[PDB]
Design an enzyme around this catalytic site. Sequence first.
Site, PDB file in Angstrom:
ATOM      1  N   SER A 166      10.878   0.157  -2.577  1.00 31.02           N
ATOM      2  CA  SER A 166      11.051  -0.116  -1.031  1.00 31.02           C
ATOM      3  C   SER A 166      10.631   0.788   0.293  1.00 31.02           C
ATOM      4  CB  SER A 166      12.725   0.777  -1.053  1.00 31.02           C
ATOM      5  OG  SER A 166      11.943   2.407  -0.912  1.00 31.02           O
ATOM      6  N   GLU A 222      -0.559   6.371  -0.856  1.00 30.10           N
ATOM      7  CA  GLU A 222       1.317   6.733  -0.180  1.00 30.10           C
ATOM      8  C   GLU A 222       0.269   8.156   0.702  1.00 30.10           C
ATOM      9  OE1 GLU A 222       3.407   5.457  -1.243  1.00 30.10           O
ATOM     10  OE2 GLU A 222       2.501   4.520  -3.547  1.00 30.10           O
ATOM     11  N   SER A 277       9.703   7.302  -8.200  1.00 26.15           N
ATOM     12  CA  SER A 277       9.138   7.146  -7.543  1.00 26.15           C
ATOM     13  C   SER A 277       8.370   8.298  -6.680  1.00 26.15           C
ATOM     14  CB  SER A 277       9.648   5.912  -6.913  1.00 26.15           C
ATOM     15  OG  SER A 277       9.187   4.454  -6.183  1.00 26.15           O
ATOM     16  N   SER A 334       6.716   0.616  -4.045  1.00 31.63           N
ATOM     17  CA  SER A 334       6.410   0.965  -5.063  1.00 31.63           C
ATOM     18  C   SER A 334       6.339   0.638  -6.777  1.00 31.63           C
ATOM     19  CB  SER A 334       7.481   2.351  -5.119  1.00 31.63           C
ATOM     20  OG  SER A 334       7.585   3.374  -4.311  1.00 31.63           O
ATOM     21  N   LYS A 339       3.248   1.315  -8.423  1.00 27.33           N
ATOM     22  CA  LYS A 339       3.057   2.124  -9.481  1.00 27.33           C
ATOM     23  C   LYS A 339       2.391   2.038 -10.560  1.00 27.33           C
ATOM     24  CE  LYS A 339       4.624   5.209  -5.459  1.00 27.33           C
ATOM     25  NZ  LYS A 339       6.833   5.718  -4.908  1.00 27.33           N
TER      26      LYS A 339
HETATM   27  B1  6M9 Z   1       8.263   3.254  -3.509  1.00 28.48           B
HETATM   28  O1  6M9 Z   1       8.617   2.202  -2.692  1.00 28.48           O
HETATM   29  O2  6M9 Z   1       9.625   3.886  -3.597  1.00 28.48           O
HETATM   30  C1  6M9 Z   1      10.719   5.388  -3.447  1.00 28.48           C
HETATM   31  C2  6M9 Z   1       9.614   4.992  -1.726  1.00 28.48           C
HETATM   32  C3  6M9 Z   1       8.228   4.087  -2.076  1.00 28.48           C
HETATM   33  C4  6M9 Z   1       7.512   4.509  -0.972  1.00 28.48           C
HETATM   34  C5  6M9 Z   1       7.927   6.007   0.427  1.00 28.48           C
HETATM   35  C6  6M9 Z   1       8.560   5.927  -0.149  1.00 28.48           C
HETATM   36  C7  6M9 Z   1      10.077   6.029  -1.064  1.00 28.48           C
END
Ligand code: 6M9
Length: 261
Positions: free
Chosen positions: A210, A139, A103, A43, A46
């Site tokens: 994550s 995603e 996120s 994430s 983003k």
């Molecule tokens: B991202 O890395 O931050 C929270 C999240 C992400 C991807 C997938 C699920 C949750």
Amino acid sequence: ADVQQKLAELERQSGGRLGVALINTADNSQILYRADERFAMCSTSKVMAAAAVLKKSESEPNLLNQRVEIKKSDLVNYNPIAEKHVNGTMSLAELSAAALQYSDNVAMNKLIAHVGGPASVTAFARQLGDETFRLDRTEPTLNTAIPGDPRDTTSPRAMAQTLRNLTLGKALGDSQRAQLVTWMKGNTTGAASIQAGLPASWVVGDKTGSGGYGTTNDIAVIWPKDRAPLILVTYFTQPQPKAESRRDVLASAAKIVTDGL
Ligand SMILES: *[B@@]1([O])O[C]C2=C1[C]=[C][C]=[C]2
Ligand SMILES: [Cl-]
Ligand code: NA
Ligand code: NA
């Protein structure tokens, strides 16, 4: 040298692979650890998607107010904000805030789609002078973080330099830069990561990540008390597919590289 020994010791104790890049704008210095290796961004990507939308808005003044439909078919694996707006619309500003501050993965997908897809986010990075960043997927699949897989990766050095440009430099117009910084300073997900390794008085705008293989990341712009700002990237990934997150490792790395400031 002592900082390098401490980061190596932290990495050894953690069991994984640690990447760090600190830029200290007080003296234009860096602290680097595996800073040219690739890590799955998860994430933390983003930030680049929101920045691409902000850049687009410089020539399209109504853009942040544009409405985007949220449908059940848009839901993915982590939708903390979007799940509250199913069957209505959200503005691109709201989606940017949700992606950066909660996120939200639907929000990220809408930012990606708006600018033309992962290859367009990547082309925006290239336009800024970042020839390392690659966003390959949408995603939720961009977070698989498989060892050896270059998809959806960057290096700590590249991300730190790019985040410097975005938040302290001139990549974005003044309004847009301020908006990115305001959004990042309002992040709700980062208190256990870089922030946890810094004094309570320091001001932080960050974006966490994550993913698979226990991947645990954070990228931050930092305003230490009465000091020039810092940029810090801490990326961490582990050998086991189902490894648990290790935000404490990011906090420890942040403490190591800022001790003495
Ligand atoms: B991202 O890395 O931050 C929270 C999240 C992400 C991807 C997938 C699920 C949750
Ligand atoms: Cl403190
Ligand atoms: Na990058
Ligand atoms: Na943080």
